[PDB]
């Protein structure tokens, strides 16, 4: 979460854009595939292992 | 790994994508780095492809 220069999307924004593009592409190319999104390093936690 | 095991279908390819911009997430503690290395090794041995 930081902008090294102006008019430059942050790394988090770039990752979100890439994830959205992959999701959209998978919707059309092969909708039977499985996709998951996991975030690490956040104060809140939500896992089956309760890590 | 737990998320992959949860799915009940048959996965031709199991893949993980890491979106990080830190060279040394574990530089202060060597034990954590070794644990991460071994866990990645077993994940690769299982058949999970990490990018």
């Amino acid at each position: 979460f930081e902008s090294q220069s102006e008019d430059e999307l942050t790394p988090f924004d770039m990752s979100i854009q890439c994830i959205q593009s992959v999701y959209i592409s998978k919707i059309i190319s092969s909708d039977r595939d499985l996709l998951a999104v996991v975030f690490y390093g956040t104060e809140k936690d939500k896992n089956s292992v309760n890590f | 790994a737990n998320l992959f095991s949860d799915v009940q279908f048959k996965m031709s390819h199991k893949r993980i994508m890491l979106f990080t911009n830190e060279d040394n997430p574990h530089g202060n503690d060597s034990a954590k780095a070794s644990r991460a290395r071994t866990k990645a090794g077993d994940l690769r041995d299982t058949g999970i492809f990490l990018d």
Binding site: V22, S25, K26, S29, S30 | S12, H13, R15, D51
Partner: peptide, 23 residues
């Protein structure tokens, strides 16, 4: 292995459509 598409493994990444490009 080379040229594989990161979205659909097992299918080579098709080159983008170019149309007509006169020489």
């Amino acid at each position: 292995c080379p040229g594989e598409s990161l979205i659909n493994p097992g299918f080579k990444s098709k080159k983008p459509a170019g149309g007509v490009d006169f020489d």
